[PDB]
């Protein structure tokens, strides 16, 4: 667990950073800005899948201020809304995980579009 | 990959932060500071193993300054030494991973001691 | 031996009290309620093993009443059943003792579950 | 350990009872009231040796009243005196343990005389 609040903040920020980087490699393939390689897309989606579970466990009470957090207070006051956004994200990643297993480009591109929306959706209401 | 150098620096710092947190949970169990659970020890060990590969790819040329990096210059001037320290870490992680597979407390405690030593070993020569 | 019946009753009650306390320390470790230590688990298991032989010699004829005994009459009328319950307990303790020797958490947890069952089993039919 | 004070009291009283009983079997041999048998004397002294360590760990703060304790307050207020008596007892039991190993009657009789005095010595100042 986290000894101090700052530990939680740093942990979640670190998780989102890793997720962003690996998810980005798959998105580049989907956008045609990088050659498509099923094995590599699979590896990266696998990483995103494993990491996606992590950051959401570090939003406990008391982790609201300090260590440069960009989490809006609404994360807590509207816990219901936050739970929903997290759920959408989880669902989308499941689709991305499956798509990754099949190696089908069209499916992967569709899943990254969905997942990406899940990131933005949550960010609009709870970040910055 | 990493568009800018700072991306690499933030990537590696975040990876270490996650590794530290999850390795710490296994460590606590092995040092008698928390109840032992083979499943949880196993899960945390899996995370460490997976993540251990990640940060070592983010030490390319030019990632020596900025983004509050704590990597000593020796990381580049003493490249061989660094690859030497990284190799030890890898071996230690392979043992920790094997221990996780067996669920054997003694084996796990032995491997966390070795891994810990590999962390500090590298840190002494290349960090801060 | 026991001069008076009461001596036998107090002897067996005291033995059970010590067994309960030391078995409980092993149990706590196995149920994830306390940090695991193979040496301490081993020591406590040794005590339980040694003491387990003791109380079963203090159930001779005439020790059925007085000194606040909680042994049901069935202990004597259903002698075979009692020897049956005691035999199971003994076997369970032999396994707990063997587990203590190996230091294997899984093996220990398995044996504490069996021993526990042997305690309650006998208690249901012959205690209170 | 002990969840409640009464647990400590019951534990130590139970330990002294077992000790008293087994020590008594050796004393009877030494007094010639029972035939001398080196093996049996050895077994019993071994039990006394193992058990002798136990009761002294259950005299913590707060275990002074209730559950029918016969421990005089001096046990705590004159902690120094209590520590001494316990030390004499420990030393005597060591002698009894050795004597038991040698199977020499004269040595055993001497050790039981010493140990017995250790019981009485401590009892006079700290019990009832
Ligand atoms: C979707 C896969 C996704 C991405 C991509 C993403 C990225 C991201 C980054 C890079 C950060 C910055 C980390 C840093 O400061 O170094 C960040 C921060 C937050 N995010 Fe995000 N994010 C994605 C998904 C989600 C989801 C689904 C939610 C909400 C359910 C969410 C929330 C947040 C919050 C809040 C932060 C700030 C955390 C903090 O600074 O304390 N993101 N995200
Ligand atoms: C071993 C399992 C291990 C742990 C644990 C560990 C932790 C760790 C942390 C927490 C950081 C701080 C990151 C931050 O500032 O947010 C960190 C940083 C560096 N480490 Fe380390 N580290 C472990 C292992 C290793 C090994 C085996 C090496 C070298 C081969 C190594 C190196 C470094 C370096 C350099 C940094 C600084 C990164 C930067 O700031 O740019 N670590 N480590
Ligand atoms: C198994 C390891 C086990 C435990 C633990 C256990 C505990 C226990 C306690 C604490 C008592 C109370 C003593 C007191 O009142 O001070 C107690 C009493 C009895 N038990 Fe028991 N017991 C364990 C095991 C067994 C087994 C396997 C049997 C039967 C074959 C058994 C029987 C009894 C009986 C009878 C009593 C009452 C003794 C009396 O009051 O005269 N127990 N037990
Ligand atoms: C020496 C081998 C020894 C014997 C024998 C002995 C016996 C004994 C008995 C039987 C009791 C009664 C237990 C009960 O209530 O059922 C008893 C109680 C106490 N003793 Fe004792 N005792 C022996 C040794 C020692 C030694 C060396 C000390 C002190 C250093 C000591 C102390 C006590 C105390 C105090 C009690 C009362 C505990 C309580 O009721 O809380 N004894 N002893």
Nearest to D126 by CA among D94, D99, D86, D87: D86
Distance, CA of C91 to CA of D104 (rounded, Å)? 36
Phi, psi of C73 (to 5 degrees): -55, -30
SS3 call for B7: helix
**Which residue in the set A1, A11, A21 is minimally distant from B18, CB to CB?**
A11
Distance, CA of C98 to CA of C104 (rounded, Å)? 10
Phi, psi of D79 (to 5 degrees): -50, -30
Residue D62 burial (10 A CB sphere; 0-12, 13-18, 19+): exposed
Cβ contacts of B53 within 8 Å, gap of 6 or more: none
| CB distance A94 to A53 below 8 Å | no
Nearest to D122 by CA among D70, D80, D93, D84: D84
| CB distance D126 to D75 below 8 Å | yes
Cβ contacts of C102 within 8 Å, gap of 6 or more: none
Nearest to B55 by CA among B82, B28, B26: B82
**Which residue in the set B33, B34, B36 is minimally distant from C105, CB to CB?**
B36
CB within 8 Å of chain B, chain A residues 6-35: 7, 10-11, 13-15, 17-18, 21
C111 CB near ligand 3 (under 6 Å): no
Q: Which atom of ligand 2 is nearest to the CA of B63?
A: 41
- Å from CA of A5 to ligand 2 middle: 21
Distance, CA of D112 to CA of D103 (rounded, Å)? 13
| CB distance C91 to C49 below 8 Å | no
- Asked if C76 has any chain B CB less than 8 Å from its own CB, the reply is no
Q: Do A17 and B21 touch (CB under 8 A)?
A: no
Is B63 annotated to bind a ligand? Reply is no
Rounded to a whole number, what is the distance in angstroms from the first to the last CA of chain D?
25
How many other CB atoms are found less than 10 A from the CB of residue B2? 17
How many residues in chain C?
Answer: 128
| CB distance D81 to D125 below 8 Å | yes
Cβ contacts of C63 within 8 Å, gap of 6 or more: C2, C5, C8, C9, C69, C71
Nearest to D112 by CA among D32, D16, D55: D32
Cβ contacts of D118 within 8 Å, gap of 6 or more: D85, D88, D89, D91, D92, D93
A89 CB near ligand 1 (under 6 Å): yes
| CB distance D125 to D74 below 8 Å | yes
CA distances from D114 to D16, D107, D123 (A): 17, 11, 14
Cβ contacts of A9 within 8 Å, gap of 6 or more: A58, A63, A66, A67, A68, A69, A71
Query: Token pair 């008594």 is at which residue?
Result: D24
Q: Do B18 and A14 touch (CB under 8 A)?
A: yes
| Three-state DSSP string of chain A | CCCCHHHHHHHHHHHHHHHHHHHHHHHHHHCCCCCCCHHHHHHHHHHHHHHHCCHHHCCCCCCCCCCCCCECCHHHHCHHHHHHHHHHHHHHHHHHHHHHHHCCHHHHHHHHHHHHHHHHHHHHHHEC
Phi, psi of B73 (to 5 degrees): -55, -30
Q: What experimental approach yielded this model?
A: X-ray
| Three-state DSSP string of chain D | CCCCHHHHHHHHHHHHHHHHHHHHHHHHHHCCCCCCCHHHHHHHHHHHHHHHCCHHHCCCCCCCCCCCCCECCHHHHCHHHHHHHHHHHHHHHHHHHHHHHHCCHHHHHHHHHHHHHHHHHHHHHHEC
Q: Could you say which DSSP state residue B57 is in?
A: G
- Which residues from C are below 8 Å from B35, CB to CB? 29, 32-36
* Domain covering D1-128: architecture: Up-down Bundle (1.20)
- Asked if B68 has any chain C CB less than 8 Å from its own CB, the reply is no
Distance, CA of D37 to CA of D108 (rounded, Å)? 11
| CB distance D6 to D84 below 8 Å | no
Q: How far C106 CA lies from chain D's nearest CA (Å)?
A: 23
How many other CB atoms are found less than 10 A from the CB of residue B7? 18
CA distances from C62 to B17, C54, C65 (A): 69, 18, 7
Q: Do C32 and B33 touch (CB under 8 A)?
A: no
| CB distance C122 to C89 below 8 Å | yes
| Domain range summary for chain C, segments of one domain joined by + | 1-128
SS3 call for B127: strand
Tokens describing residue D58: 């259950």
């Amino acid at each position: 667990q986290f000894q101090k609040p700052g530990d939680a903040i740093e942990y979640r920020q670190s998780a989102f950073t890793l997720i962003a980087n690996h998810f980005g490699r798959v998105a580049a393939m989907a956008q045609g800005k990088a050659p498509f390689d099923a094995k590599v897309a699979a590896e990266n989606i696998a990483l995103v899948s494993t990491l996606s579970k992590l950051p959401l466990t570090a939003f406990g009470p008391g982790t609201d201020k300090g260590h440069g957090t960009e989490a809006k207070p609404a994360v807590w006051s509207d816990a219901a809304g936050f739970k929903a956004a997290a759920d959408k994200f989880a669902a989308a990643v499941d689709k991305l995980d499956a798509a990754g297993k099949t190696g089908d480009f069209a499916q992967i591109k569709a899943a990254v579009g969905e997942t990406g929306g899940a990131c933005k959706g949550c960010h609009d209401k709870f970040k910055e």
